[PDB]
Recover the amino acids of this structure.
C-alpha cells in the first residue's frame, strides 16, 4: 500500500498531465499553423496578425 | 520688337509652365492627403498602401 498503491495512484500523474498538455500543445500548434497560412497573398496586415497567432 | 514683343510673347513663358505644373502638383497632393485618410482605423495593409500615396 505504501509504495506500489501510491506509485499507481499518484506517482504517474504529473507525467501524464504534462504529456497530455504537450500533445494538446502540438494540436493547438497544428491548427495555428493553418491559421497563420490562410491569409491571401496580396494581404499584409492580416498576414502580420496571422503570423502573430503562430 | 526686340524687348517688348519678345518679353510678352516668350519672356513670361517658363514661369507659367512652372506655375501650372506646381498647381497640378498641389491638386494631386490635396486629393492624395484625402486618399491617405479614407482608410478604416483597424486596417493595416490599406493604411501602409495609402501612406506611400501621400
Amino acid at each position: 500500500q505504501q509504495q506500489i498503491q501510491t506509485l499507481v495512484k499518484e506517482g504517474l500523474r504529473g507525467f501524464r498531465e504534462a504529456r497530455r498538455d504537450f500533445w494538446r500543445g502540438a494540436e493547438s500548434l497544428e491548427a495555428a499553423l493553418t491559421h497563420n497560412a490562410e491569409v491571401p497573398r496580396r494581404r499584409a496586415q492580416e498576414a502580420e496578425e496571422a503570423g502573430a497567432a503562430l
